[PDB]
Design a protein around this nucleic acid. Structure first.
Ligand SMILES: [Mg+2]
Ligand SMILES: [Zn+2]
Ligand SMILES: [Zn+2]
Ligand SMILES: [Zn+2]
Lengths: 115, 42, 260, 67, 404, 49, 51, 46, 97, 51, 475
RNA sequence: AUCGAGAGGA
């Protein structure tokens, strides 16, 4: 009667975009990234990778409502840096981490199966 | 001869089982209706 | 400001599970990998049923739900198949789904077990795990003499985020800091708690001395496979899918920075 | 009414273990030892086999609608 | 919309809400606004009325909206406060030894709607930067309100001696310029009573700011409780063997004193007190032996509790339960009464066929000397069922006559 | 006729025989079928005579 | 003194920590079946024409 | 057009037109069941 | 008629007749069916607000369940047999006399 | 009290007794509500029962 | 006691102080069986238990136990003259003898409970109102109400997909046949505060478990109809209506019906659809539509269609429609301890908290439901169920059993590598961090109750009105 | 459809 399709949590509706960037006028050099059809899986890793950047002053995320399927990520950086640049570098670092982890897991399987 | 305490806790339940093997749970309904048909109508 | 250099150490590898340790990574990365094991590793599962005849004692949705939960070998085929969202065909085609037939009738007196072995596929690579060449076959329904079940299923690509039938795992054990050194748990009575299998403490000592400067490193995983994929294939798919989500997010991010 | 396919909790397949479980039980295994023989570690899967009531066996005592 | 729950007892049983469309097929309510409706989520249903004109919409917006309904004219005090999980968790959060890491603090600041975007200076900068729970609740607290309260565990002899303004137990809530300077928040500070932080927020700040205050407490504290967690199990119903054996010694006093009194009455050694017959004096004297026993065993169980105990955690926060519940779960369930008296002789001079005739002892007349963890004996079970039936009858019979 | 009573056709039937009439062997009986609707008589308290 | 009314709905209530105190979470089905008569103006002509 | 029914007693295939009293012609049983339709109902195995 | 409607009495005296006898059997779950078949009823009248007939009397021990009772307007008026409780069917006194 | 002392005495005493009933369980009600009830109950020179 | 001229149900009360001997043979006397006691000794010896053990061979039954003078039915009025031993341990010579002149003994005190209260595990560890509320709610729990449900055309019926017998049971359920037609599922319950969606008597369910069939049910609804030929003035008939002859035809399509006017089994039917096409001859000419529609907003599948003749003998049709009910937010669930609550939210397996071995709870209930309610039986059942699942048992939760207390269960649980009190370290599903509090988790028998939100949700905006007063209808 | 009855829910 009122059950949303299970694909709604991860599929995107037409005309609604994956990520939206919004100044935060609160404080300088802060942005809100509203990411649609993602959840804690990406929000947590992006936030923690951003917390590794010493030029990031604030990094946080929230799922505003569990029944809704978007996350907000707030990023504040130092004035010489940009929250968009910080977000990009965090994603790049996560990708490189996962590529390295994948290659090393392949090697570890390789070794386990043959010795 | 005597049921000792160590056996009691299944002696008793054995007894209870026998009761429900004989009577059931709706024995009052069936007995009442049976008495009504065998006696009360006549 | 840059990526971790995680290392991996696989401590057990069977056909049933993989037990490994990731070391020098963040807890968020470890938990996202754990979550992707369960929710974003695609496999093949029956997601469309057509009951042509069902005289069994289980109604049609019961049979359909039961068929959806049978694991299908998805090892090399899942990467090749498309989502039916992405396929340019009609309802079905061999590029986005796999056909199954089942047609059983109990003639003898004596109860017929319609099992996953009766699910006949058009694709030899995608078959029920129990049917793969020990463990018995998954029981779909028991039929009495005169009862009959004839149906036609289609199996599609999906992941556990849509339905648990596309979840390839049969339990993902995840642990870190087996000795409570970070004190992320606070035992009222630490002596009463059993030791972790990964604990490295003498029996007199209940938990490790508190580490003020530590964080979570060295996460222990035991990924058990339901059968559709190998456990190492589950882990490799999980890493690829998590990565590759991050790549899509990056692409959209670049467009959205561009457009401003 | 019939053995579930997956464990409700973890998703381990238990639908191929009911018949083997019963065979082990008539072979004079204890329920725990039988569950150990089938590889059900976790008390969720042990719950699935140990608490199952095979009602389908009773539903098959009725003649079907068509001969 | 107007949102209503029956029975509509007072004006807070119908309040104005703004609609938020959400997926599934239930009416989804905030948890602070459950107390005004007397609503819980065990199958309760509620009614939504949609005003059909701008006239009525403005009327409900300006008169009946929930933030305008925070303080009731019935008892000049808030009608909604902080409730179960948020209250247990804010009690645990504002303890003196709650230290938050940088990432945890940022995670909690994501859930503050009224946040100026400035991360406060941590209370501890070295060897590690650590924020305190009071430091974050200070950000939750609105405006510049000032408030003095006392935590429920505040000792009564602390305000006299030294350490009045530096409390060893972190009781004596002091909020000053909108910062929680000190103290553990609880029902006395965030509940529905008069002079609490929510009341003072409504009086000093408006209803909008107080609405945001409620929402912010709930969101921040719930997302912190995701880290802290709260539970209850068997371990919270256990006491140490010292305590058990103290309680058994107390009960065996109490029975053996009641036997003392029973012989005095049997030998006519007992004289009435003024204003009562000899029966009624004996009954008083036994009931006051057994209430002393129940109170003493309850005290023993209370003092046995740790500050990891979750029963205690929910009782200090005022979220749920009372000390008498802890006593009944751990120490002794106590005397079962029917119509304000001990169990009556429903048989011939007997409460049950398992007792001798004319047995006024504690067992016979419905004293449950066991706890709920120990388990009741069959006679205790029946007498307890009798007392509980009295409660059920009262609940089911008072309604018609109060409603009339 | 009350079901499973002495004058019921299900009286003395085995679990076979009940299933083979499309009856549940675990059905206790004790009720009437009036116009296809299963009716149960509730025992009524009264003050002894 | 009391009567049945149109434009009313009833259903089971559920917790939602992520609503403000003045919010009520409502289903699509109730909201799709309940309506509000909004007057047309040049201020709202376009929006109401989509609806 | 035929609208064949099944007997509740003897499980016999048998055709019955409208305005005909319902009675199986094997065994005279009074209760009959319709056959499963021949349209195509689809189930998502969920 | 009387078993179909539950109005216990002549159909003409449909208001002097006492309803609630002969209820529709609860077939929700097996426990509901068993309990409904072991249900007792105290015709004091739900309107009555005297608690005395609703109290759990000491003499219900072993005869009536101390717990199973509706929590609404009939609390303690609708009762249930204890498991080994058996209601006597009646007998002839002539052998005893 | 009304018969012996009069309408204002019974107004006061009725306030007192209602306050005793309300506050015995530790509860509190704003005095203006009790005052309004007791004034409705005595404004016509006799004891007006709420019936 | 010899089964002589006096039959067993005859009550014989001697009032001694007043010199009456009152003998009762009439009907309606509630009585119960009790073990007779000799000087201080049960008449029930081991020979009786031995013969009872082979009850299926030597046809030594209860009724021989009664005939042996070992058991006696005692009515309420004769209990006033009886001195009962609660257990044979009361007969045992003590340092201070309480009675020393007992006449009867309880077979077992747990027989004071009825059918629904005999389901409760550890009812003597709960507040009594909780036991009453469960005794009420066990009658709304879904299960398999009867084995031959496939042939019954009940107006309403709920059948659970996967009923389970409780892991923690009482010895009375062996006679209630609860093991054979159970009405619930053993769920991995964690009592925790997780996201706030279980506050105030609400539960958080595992979406993945629900996907695997957890507490899934099927709802069967039967529709009657009969075509009446009461007189030549007007006659009804089942037949696919037509737009040209029928007058009161709704705009709903009648294509799902067959020639005979009856829908076929296996046809998916949505709200307001037609399942029986019935037309009544008039005095849009010479026949008016009186078809049977589905009860609105149901959306099931026609399970089966039966046709027969009623008593007077016109056509009579019964159509059973089948609707799968998957648990969702707002569905009511209950344990066996009065702990009821609706589903507040459903999280997937990766969102739920997990143990070191990746066990997620099926249900999460709020700890604030325990303290005021004092349902310690819930906690003891959870702990016993953890022991039973780890041991391969069924736990014994019979009410008054001194061979089972919390300590001995905890000692058993500590032997399986678990914290003895049933607590476990859980990890946050969203972040993977350990929860600072160790959560109490284990198997507990839960019940899905008939009260589903989809049968309760209702809305109105200018619908039908009552004839007398032009006000909205009722219901 | 109306009336009544009963069983339930909060
Ligand atoms: Mg409620
Ligand atoms: Zn395709
Ligand atoms: Zn499992
Ligand atoms: Zn036939």
């Amino acid at each position: 009667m009122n059950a949303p399709p299970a694909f709604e949590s991860f599929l995107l509706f037409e005309g609604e975009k994956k990520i939206t960037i919004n100044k935060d006028t609160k404080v300088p050099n802060a942005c809100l990234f509203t990411i649609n059809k993602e959840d804690h899986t990406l929000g947590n890793i992006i936030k923690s990778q951003l917390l590794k950047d010493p030029q990031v002053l604030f990094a946080g995320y929230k799922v505003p409502h569990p029944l809704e399927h978007k996350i907000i990520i707030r990023v504040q950086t130092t004035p010489d840096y940009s929250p968009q640049e910080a977000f990009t570098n965090a994603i790049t670092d996560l990708i490189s981490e996962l590529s390295l982890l994948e290659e090393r897991f392949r090697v570890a399987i390789k070794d386990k199966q043959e010795g | 001869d005597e049921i000792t305490p160590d056996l009691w806790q299944e002696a008793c339940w054995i007894v209870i089982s026998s009761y429900f093997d004989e009577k059931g749970l709706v024995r009052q309904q069936l007995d009442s209706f049976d008495e009504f048909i065998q006696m009360s109508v006549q | 400001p840059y990526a971790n250099q995680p290392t991996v150490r696989i401590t057990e590898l069977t056909d049933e599970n993989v037990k490994f340790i990731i070391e020098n990574t963040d807890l968020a990365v470890a938990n996202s990998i754990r979550r992707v094991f369960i929710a974003e590793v695609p496999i093949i599962a029956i997601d469309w049923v057509q009951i042509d005849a069902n005289s069994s004692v289980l109604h049609d949705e019961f049979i359909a739900h039961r068929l959806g939960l049978i694991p299908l070998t998805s090892d090399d085929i899942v990467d090749k198949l498309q989502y039916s969202r992405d396929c340019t065909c009609e309802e079905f085609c061999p590029e986005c789904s796999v056909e199954f037939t089942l047609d059983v009738r109990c003639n003898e007196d004596q109860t017929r077990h319609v099992t996953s072995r009766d699910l006949i596929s058009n694709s030899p690579r995608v078959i029920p795990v129990t049917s793969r060449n020990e463990q018995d076959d998954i029981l779909i329904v028991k039929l009495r003499k005169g009862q009959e079940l004839r149906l036609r299923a289609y199996a599609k690509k999906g992941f556990g985020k849509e339905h648990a039938k596309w979840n390839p795992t049969a339990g993902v054990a995840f642990e870190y800091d087996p000795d409570n050194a970070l004190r992320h748990t606070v035992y009222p009575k630490p002596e009463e708690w059993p030791k972790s299998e990964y604990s490295e403490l003498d029996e007199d000592e209940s938990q490790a001395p508190y580490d003020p400067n530590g964080k979570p490193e060295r996460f222990y995983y035991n990924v058990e496979s339901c059968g559709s994929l190998r456990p190492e294939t589950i882990v490799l798919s999980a890493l690829s899918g998590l990565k590759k989500k991050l790549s899509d997010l990056q692409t959209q991010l670049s467009h959205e920075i561009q457009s401003d | 009414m019939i053995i579930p396919v997956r464990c409700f909790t973890c998703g381990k397949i238990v639908g191929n273990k009911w018949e083997a479980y019963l065979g082990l039980l008539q072979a004079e295994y204890t329920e725990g030892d039988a569950l150990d023989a089938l590889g059900l570690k976790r008390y969720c899967c042990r719950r699935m086999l140990l608490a199952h009531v095979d009602l389908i066996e009773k539903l098959l005592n009725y003649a079907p609608l068509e001969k | 919309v107007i949102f209503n729950r029956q029975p509509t007892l007072h004006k807070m049983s119908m309040m104005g809400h703004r609609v938020r469309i959400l997926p599934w097929s239930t009416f989804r309510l905030n948890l602070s606004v459950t107390t005004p409706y007397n609503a819980d989520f065990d199958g309760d249903e509620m009614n939504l009325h949609l005003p059909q004109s701008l006239e009525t919409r403005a009327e409900i917006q300006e008169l009946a909206m929930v933030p305008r309904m925070i303080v009731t004219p019935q008892s000049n005090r808030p009608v909604m406060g902080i409730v179960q999980d948020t209250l247990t968790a804010v009690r645990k959060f504002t303890k003196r030894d709650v230290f938050l890491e940088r990432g945890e603090v940022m995670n909690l600041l994501m859930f503050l709607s009224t946040w100026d975007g400035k991360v406060p200076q941590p209370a501890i900068l070295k060897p590690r930067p650590l924020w305190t729970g009071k430091q974050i609740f200070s950000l939750i607290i609105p405006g510049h309100i000032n408030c003095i309260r006392t935590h429920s565990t505040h000792p009564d002899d602390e305000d006299s001696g030294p350490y009045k303004h530096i409390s060893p137990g972190d009781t004596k809530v002091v909020v000053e310029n909108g910062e929680l300077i000190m103290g553990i928040l609880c029902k006395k500070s965030l509940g529905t009573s008069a002079g609490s932080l929510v009341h003072i927020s409504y009086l000093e700040m408006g209803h909008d700011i107080t609405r945001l205050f409620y929402s912010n407490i709930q969101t921040v504290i719930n997302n912190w409780l995701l880290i802290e967690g709260h539970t209850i199990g068997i371990g919270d119903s256990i006491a140490d063997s010292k305590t058990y054996q103290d309680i058994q010694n107390t009960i065996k006093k109490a029975k053996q004193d009641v036997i003392e009194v029973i012989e005095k009455a049997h030998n006519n050694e007992l004289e009435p007190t003024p204003g009562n017959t000899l029966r009624q004096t004996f009954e008083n004297q036994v009931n006051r032996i057994l209430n002393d026993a129940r109170d003493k065993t309850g005290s023993s169980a209370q003092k046995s509790l740790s500050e990891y105990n979750n029963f205690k955690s929910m009782v200090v926060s005022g979220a749920k339960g009372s000390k008498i519940n802890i006593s009944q779960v751990i120490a002794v369930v106590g005397q079962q009464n029917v119509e304000g008296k001990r169990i009556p002789f429903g048989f011939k001079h007997r409460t049950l066929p398992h007792f001798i005739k004319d047995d006024y002892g504690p067992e016979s007349r419905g004293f449950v000397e066991n706890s709920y963890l120990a388990g009741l004996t069959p006679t205790e079970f029946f007498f307890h069922a009798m007392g509980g039936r009295e409660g059920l009858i009262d609940t089911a019979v008072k309604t018609a006559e109060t409603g009339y | 006729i009350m079901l499973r009573s002495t004058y019921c056709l299900l009286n003395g039937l085995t679990d076979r025989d009940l299933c083979e009439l499309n009856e549940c062997p675990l059905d206790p009986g004790g009720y009437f079928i009036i116009n296809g609707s299963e009716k149960v008589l509730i025992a009524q308290e009264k003050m002894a005579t | 003194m009391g009567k049945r009314v149109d434009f009313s709905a009833r259903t089971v209530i559920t917790p939602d920590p992520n609503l403000s105190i003045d919010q009520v979470g409502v289903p699509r089905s109730i909201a799709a079946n309940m309506t509000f008569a909004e007057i047309v103006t040049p201020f709202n002509i376009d929006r109401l024409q989509e609806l | 057009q035929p609208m064949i029914y099944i007997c509740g007693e003897c499980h016999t295939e048998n055709e019955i037109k409208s305005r005909d009293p319902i009675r199986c012609r094997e065994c005279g049983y009074r209760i009959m069941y319709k056959k499963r339709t021949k349209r195509l109902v689809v189930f998502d195995a969920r | 008629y009387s078993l179909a409607t539950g109005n216990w009495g002549d159909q003409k005296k449909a208001h002097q007749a006492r309803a609630g006898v002969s209820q529709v059997l609860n077939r929700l779950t097996f426990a509901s069916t068993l309990s409904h078949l072991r249900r007792l009823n105290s015709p004091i009248g739900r309107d009555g607000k005297l608690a005395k007939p609703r109290q759990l009397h000491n003499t219900l021990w072993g005869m009536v369940c101390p717990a199973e009772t509706p929590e609404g307007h009939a609390v303690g008026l609708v009762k249930n047999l204890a498991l080994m409780a058996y209601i006597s069917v009646g007998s002839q006194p002539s052998p005893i006399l | 009290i009304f018969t012996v002392l009069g309408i204002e005495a019974v107004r006061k005493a009725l306030e007192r007794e209602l306050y005793h009933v309300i506050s015995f369980d530790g509860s509190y009600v704003n005095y203006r509500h009790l005052a309004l009830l007791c004034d409705t109950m005595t404004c016509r020179g006799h004891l007006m029962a709420i019936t | 006691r010899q089964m002589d001229i006096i039959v067993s149900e005859v009550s014989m009360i001697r009032d001694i102080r007043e010199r009456e001997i009152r003998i009762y043979t009439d009907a309606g006397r509630i009585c119960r069986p009790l073990l007779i006691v000799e000087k201080q000794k049960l008449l029930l010896k081991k020979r009786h238990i031995d013969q009872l053990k082979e009850r299926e061979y030597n046809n030594y039954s209860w009724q021989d136990l009664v005939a042996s003078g070992v058991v006696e039915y005692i009515d309420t009025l004769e209990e006033e003259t009886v001195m009962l031993a609660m257990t044979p341990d009361d007969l045992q010579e003590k340092e201070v003898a309480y009675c020393s002149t007992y006449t009867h003994c309880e077979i077992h005190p747990s027989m004071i409970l009825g059918v629904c209260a005999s389901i409760i595990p550890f009812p003597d560890h709960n507040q009594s109102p909780r036991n009453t509320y469960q005794s009420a709610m066990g009658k709304q729990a879904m299960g398999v109400y009867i084995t031959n449900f496939h042939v019954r055309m009940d107006t309403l019926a709920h059948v659970l997909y996967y009923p389970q017998k409780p892991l923690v049971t009482t010895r009375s359920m062996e006679y209630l046949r609860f093991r054979e037609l159970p009405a619930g599922i053993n769920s991995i319950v964690a009592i925790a505060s997780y996201t706030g969606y279980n506050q105030e008597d609400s539960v958080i369910m595992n979406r993945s478990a629900v996907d695997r069939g957890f507490f899934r049910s099927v709802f069967y609804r039967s529709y009657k109809e009969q075509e009446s030929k009461k007189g030549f003035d007007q006659e009804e008939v089942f037949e696919k209506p037509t737009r040209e002859t029928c007058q009161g035809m709704r705009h709903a399509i009648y294509d799902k019906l067959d020639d005979d006017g009856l829908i076929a089994p296996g046809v998916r039917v949505s709200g307001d659809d037609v399942i029986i096409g019935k037309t009544v001859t008039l005095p849009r000419y010479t026949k008016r539509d009186c078809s049977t529609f589905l009860r609105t907003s149901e959306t099931g599948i026609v399970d089966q269609v039966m046709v027969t003749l009623n008593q007077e003998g016109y056509k009579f049709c019964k159509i059973r429609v089948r609707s799968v009910r998957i648990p969702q937010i707002g569905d009511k669930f209950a344990s066996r301890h009065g702990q009821k609550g609706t589903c507040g939210i459903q999280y997937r397996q990766e969102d739920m908290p997990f143990t070191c071995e990746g066990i997620t709870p099926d249900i999460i209930i709020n700890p604030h439901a325990i303290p005021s309610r004092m349902t310690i039986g819930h906690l003891i059942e959870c702990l016993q169920g953890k022991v039973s699942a780890n041991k391969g048992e069924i736990g014994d939760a019979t009410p008054f059993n001194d061979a089972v207390n919390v300590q001995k269960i905890s000692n058993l649980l500590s032997d399986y590598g678990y914290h003895l009190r049933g607590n476990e370290v859980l990890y946050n599903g969203f972040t993977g961090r350990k929860i600072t509090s160790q959560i109490f988790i284990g198997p507990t028998y839960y019940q899905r109750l008939k009260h589903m939100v989809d049968d309760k949700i209702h809305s109105r905006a200018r619908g039908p009105i009552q004839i007398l007063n032009r006000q909205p209808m009722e219901g």
